[PDB]
Amino acid sequence: VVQAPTQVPGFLGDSVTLPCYLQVPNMEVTHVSQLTWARHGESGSMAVFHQTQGPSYSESKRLEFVAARLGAELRDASLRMFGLRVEDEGSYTCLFVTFPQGSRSVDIWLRVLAKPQNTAEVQKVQLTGEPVPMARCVSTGGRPPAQITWHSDLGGMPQTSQVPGFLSGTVTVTSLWILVPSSQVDGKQVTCKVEHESFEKPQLLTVSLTVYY
Numbered sequence: 001v002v003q004a005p006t007q008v009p010g011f012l013g014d015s016v017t018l019p020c021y022l023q024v025p026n027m028e029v030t031h032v033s034q035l036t037w038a039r040h041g042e043s044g045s046m047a048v049f050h051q052t053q054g055p056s057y058s059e060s061k062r063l064e065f066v067a068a069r070l071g072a073e074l075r076d077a078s079l080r081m082f083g084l085r086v087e088d089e090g091s092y093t094c095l096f097v098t099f100p101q102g103s104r105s106v107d108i109w110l111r112v113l114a115k116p117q118n119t120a121e122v123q124k125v126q127l128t129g130e131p132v133p134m135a136r137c138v139s140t141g142g143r144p145p146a147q148i149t150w151h152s153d154l155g156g157m158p159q160t161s162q163v164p165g166f167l168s169g170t171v172t173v174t175s176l177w178i179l180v181p182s183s184q185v186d187g188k189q190v191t192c193k194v195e196h197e198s199f200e201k202p203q204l205l206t207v208s209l210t211v212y213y
Contacts, residue, residue: 004022035094
């Protein structure tokens with residue numbers, strides 16, 4: 001009966017793969033187990049895979065399955081999936097067919113998208129006053145957008161706003177940056193902690209500033 005962990009990322013480029021497969025329980029063991037994966041998704045009717053008499057493809061002659069039949073197994077196919085575009089999910093399901101009734105298996109669809117790379121720096125003068133003294137700190141290109149914290153020591157800004165990126169290769173590209181007012185401490189420091197569902201840990205970025213004159 002049907003298993004496949006199935007909660008998996010999932011970043012463009014890309015391009016990778018997803019396991020739908022089975023335990024033999026075990027004082028039972030059967031045929032025939034002939035594969036399919038659908039959408040549901042516009043499940044009318046199938047970004048289909050079947051292997052059974054061979055491998056069969058929708059207008060994805062390419063992509064490329066794993067778990068070569070060429071006989072028996074008894075089957076358990078995860079698809080190696082490259083690639084490499086915004087289907088994510090997909091809400092997909094691998095399916096088997098057998099005489100242990102077992103005419104089926106289970107939907108599912110999991111971790112799904114890509115990241116940026118960011119920059120950030122300070123500028124420019126101070127005529128009091130006041131704000132953005134500042135930092136172009138940016139989220140640039142990433143799928144899961146971040147958002148950034150500033151714990152500039154002074155931190156003196158309920159004031160650090162946003163930009164709905166407008167998307168690079170189709171995604172965020174947003175900047176966000178603090179509106180500190182006037183004064184001195186040139187020439188000190190600030191923090192940009194960029195958050196995000198990747199690179200295990202919130203990178204962050206920091207600089208002195210710019211007294212004036």
